[PDB]
Amino acid sequence: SKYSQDVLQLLYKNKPNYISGQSIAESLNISRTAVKKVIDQLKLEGCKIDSVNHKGHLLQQLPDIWYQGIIDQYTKSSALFDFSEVYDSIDSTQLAAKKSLVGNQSSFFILSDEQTKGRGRFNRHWSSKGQGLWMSVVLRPNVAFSMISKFNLFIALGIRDAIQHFSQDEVKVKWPNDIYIDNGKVCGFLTEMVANNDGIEAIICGIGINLTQQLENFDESIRHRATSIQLHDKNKLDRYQFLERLLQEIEKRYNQFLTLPFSEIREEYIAASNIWNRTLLFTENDKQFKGQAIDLDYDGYLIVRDEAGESHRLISADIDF
Amino acid sequence: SKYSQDVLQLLYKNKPNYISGQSIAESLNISRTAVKKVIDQLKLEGCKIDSVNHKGHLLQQLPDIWYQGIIDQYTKSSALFDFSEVYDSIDSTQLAAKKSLVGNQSSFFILSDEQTKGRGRFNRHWSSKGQGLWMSVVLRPNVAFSMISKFNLFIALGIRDAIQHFSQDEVKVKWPNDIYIDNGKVCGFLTEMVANNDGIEAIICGIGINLTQQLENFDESIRHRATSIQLHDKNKLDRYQFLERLLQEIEKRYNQFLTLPFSEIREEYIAASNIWNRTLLFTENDKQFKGQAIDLDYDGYLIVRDEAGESHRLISADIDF
Ligand SMILES: Cc1ccc2oc(=O)n(CCCCn3nnc(CCCCC[C@@H]4SC[C@@H]5NC(=O)N[C@@H]54)c3F)c2c1
Ligand SMILES: Cc1ccc2oc(=O)n(CCCCn3nnc(CCCCC[C@@H]4SC[C@@H]5NC(=O)N[C@@H]54)c3F)c2c1
Kindly list the domain boundaries of chain A, sorted by start residue: 1-63, 64-274, 275-321
Determine whether B180 is exposed, middle or buried from the number of CB atoms within 10 Å of its CB (0-12, 13-18, 19+).
buried
Exposure of B163 in the CB half-sphere (CA atoms within 13 A): 35
**Nearest chain B Cα distance for residue A100, angstroms:** 9
- Element of type H or E holding A271: helix A266-271
Among A112, A116, A126, say which to mutate for ligand 1: greatest number of ligand atoms within 8 Å of CB: A126
Substitution target from B92, B100, B102 for chain A, most A beta carbons within 10 A: B102
> Which is it for strands B184-196 and B178-181: parallel, antiparallel or unpaired?
antiparallel
Q: Which of A253, A275, A50 shows the shortest CA–CA distance to A141?
A: A253
- Element of type H or E holding B196: strand B184-196
Preceding peptide of B16 cis, ω within 30°:
yes
Nearest CA in chain B to A105: B123
**Cβ(B168)–Cβ(B234) below 8 Å:** yes
Which neighbouring-strand residues pair with B280?
B291
Ligand 1 atom 13: the closest Cα is on which residue?
A120
Substitution target from B150, B197, B207 for chain A, most A beta carbons within 10 A: B197
Of B95, B176, B195, the CB nearest to A195: B195
Interface contact B198-A91, CB threshold 8 A: no
Interface contact A176-B197, CB threshold 8 A: yes
Q: How many whole angstroms separate alpha carbon B8 and alpha carbon B31?
A: 16
Helix, strand counts (H, E) of chain A: 8, 14
**Cβ(A233)–Cβ(A168) below 8 Å:** yes
Chain A residue set in contact with B, beta carbons under 8 Å: 91-92, 95, 98-99, 102-103, 121-122, 145-146, 148-149, 152, 176, 190-198, 201, 315-316
Alpha carbon separation from A230 to A159, A184, A187, A207 (Å, rounded): 16, 12, 13, 17
**Cβ(B269)–Cβ(B157) below 8 Å:** yes
**Nearest chain B Cα distance for residue A146, angstroms:** 8
Nearest CA in chain A to B96: A102
What 8-state DSSP symbol labels residue B37?
H
What does the angle CA B184 – CA B276 – CA B251 come to, to the nearest 5 degrees?
A: 65
How many other CB atoms are found less than 10 A from the CB of residue A90?
21
**Cβ(B9)–Cβ(B73) below 8 Å:** yes
Give the position, in ligand 1's atom list, of the atom nearest the Cα of A126.
Answer: 10
- Inter-axis angle of helices B4-14 and B21-28, to 10 degrees? 130
Distance A92 CA to ligand 1 centre (A): 12
Instruction: Show the beta-strand stretches assigned E in chain A.
Output: 48-52, 56-61, 83-90, 108-115, 132-139, 171-174, 178-181, 184-196, 199-210, 280-284, 287-296, 302-306, 311-314, 318-320
Contacts of B190 in chain A (CB under 8 A): 196
- Inter-axis angle of helices A148-164 and A239-259, to 10 degrees? 140
Resolution (A): 2.4
> Which is it for strands A171-174 and A311-314: parallel, antiparallel or unpaired?
unpaired
Give the position, in ligand 2's atom list, of the atom nearest the Cα of B178.
Answer: 33
Amino acid type, A221? S
**Nearest chain B Cα distance for residue A271, angstroms:** 23
How many other CB atoms are found less than 10 A from the CB of residue A140?
17
Give the position, in ligand 2's atom list, of the atom nearest the Cα of B210.
Answer: 1
> Which is it for strands B108-115 and B83-90: parallel, antiparallel or unpaired?
parallel
Contacts of A95 in chain B (CB under 8 A): 102-103
- The reply to whether B48 sits in an annotated binding site is no
- The reply to whether B140 sits in an annotated binding site is no
Which neighbouring-strand residues pair with B287?
B284
Ligand number with the minimum distance to the CA of B283: 2
Q: How many whole angstroms separate alpha carbon B281 and alpha carbon A10?
A: 57
Q: How many whole angstroms separate alpha carbon B203 and alpha carbon B226?
A: 28
Alpha carbon separation from A67 to A7, A244, B150, B285 (Å, rounded): 11, 14, 46, 42
Contacts of A152 in chain B (CB under 8 A): 197
Buried b / exposed e across A203-232, counting CB within 10 Å, b at 16+? bbbbbbbbbbbeeeebeeeeeeebbbbbbb
- The reply to whether B119 sits in an annotated binding site is yes
Contacts of A192 in chain B (CB under 8 A): 194-196, 201
Interface contact A99-B95, CB threshold 8 A: no
Q: How many whole angstroms separate alpha carbon A164 and alpha carbon B310?
A: 50
Contacts of A193 in chain B (CB under 8 A): 145, 194-196
Determine whether B91 is exposed, middle or buried from the number of CB atoms within 10 Å of its CB (0-12, 13-18, 19+).
middle
Preceding peptide of B63 cis, ω within 30°:
no
Substitution target from A92, A100, A142, A196 for chain B, most B beta carbons within 10 A: A196
Q: How many whole angstroms separate alpha carbon A27 and alpha carbon A309?
A: 71
**Cβ(A100)–Cβ(A138) below 8 Å:** yes
Contacts of B142 in chain A (CB under 8 A): none
**Nearest chain A Cα distance for residue B192, angstroms:** 4
- Please, which experimental method was used? X-ray
Q: How many whole angstroms separate alpha carbon A249 and alpha carbon A241?
A: 13
Interface contact B195-A192, CB threshold 8 A: yes
**Cβ(A213)–Cβ(A205) below 8 Å:** no
Interface contact B195-A190, CB threshold 8 A: no
